[PDB]
Amino acid sequence: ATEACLPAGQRKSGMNINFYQYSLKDSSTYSNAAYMAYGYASKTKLGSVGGQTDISIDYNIPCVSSSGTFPCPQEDSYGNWGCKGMGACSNSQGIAYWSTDLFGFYTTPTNVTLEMTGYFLPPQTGSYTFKFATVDDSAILSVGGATAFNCCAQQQPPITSTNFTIDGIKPSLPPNIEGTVYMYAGYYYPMKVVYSNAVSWGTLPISVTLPDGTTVSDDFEGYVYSFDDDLSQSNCTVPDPSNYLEVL
Numbered sequence: 001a002t003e004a005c006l007p008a009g010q011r012k013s014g015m016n017i018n019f020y021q022y023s024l025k026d027s028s029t030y031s032n033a034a035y036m037a038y039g040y041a042s043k044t045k046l047g048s049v050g051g052q053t054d055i056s057i058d059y060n061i062p063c064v065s066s067s068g069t070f071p072c073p074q075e076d077s078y079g080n081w082g083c084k085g086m087g088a089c090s091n092s093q094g095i096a097y098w099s100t101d102l103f104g105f106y107t108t109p110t111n112v113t114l115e116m117t118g119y120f121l122p123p124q125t126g127s128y129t130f131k132f133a134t135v136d137d138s139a140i141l142s143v144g145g146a147t148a149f150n151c152c153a154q155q156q157p158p159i160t161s162t163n164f165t166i167d168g169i170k171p172s173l174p175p176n177i178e179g180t181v182y183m184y185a186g187y188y189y190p191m192k193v194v195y196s197n198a199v200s201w202g203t204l205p206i207s208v209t210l211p212d213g214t215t216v217s218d219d220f221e222g223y224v225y226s227f228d229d230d231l232s233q234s235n236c237t238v239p240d241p242s243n244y245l246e247v248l
Ligand code: NA
Pocket: 136, 137, 197, 198, 199, 200, 201, 202
């Protein structure tokens, strides 16, 4: 069974996002499981935002044209280089860019690592299939109190588990990388996404298919929550929700 939790403190809507330094055009650091599970936090912490319910990433670099500067959808880049409907671009694909596109935090989405944490609250008991439609550049998803982070300890340093629910670590990988978790209604499941980009475009389309077959994509409002740490809440961890002994 996947470990879940019952935090007793004030629930907040959305995930916390911590941002950490990642070097432009470093294509090797994020290829390692240890880095993606926890090593990212040994680099400089850039900052954080909270309360985020729209969690998909779709970062497009600028195209500087005489008609102005506009983000170029990845699929519209061509040549050496232009953007369809904009002509040739005067700016490089290969430098850092500053934007608030990631969760409103002003940083360099071209080169950054971020950690999303929160608790997923299943409305229905059954099999949930999480998916990343594509990954630019490297990402993991972990679900469970022994795999994502410890119950009632959302804000602590990362745990060392490499038992990822979705392993999207840059070796490129196929599209539509998926991992399934059997979940019991009403229990709060620790959830961690770590995402990294080294250059240019960044993409992580996150979705989950519910037991009833419906798909929730990008906007996880009503499903994801945060709690401030309470390391003193003795009963918080539920190692096997299918054998929890009290009334939920
Ligand atoms: Na990229």
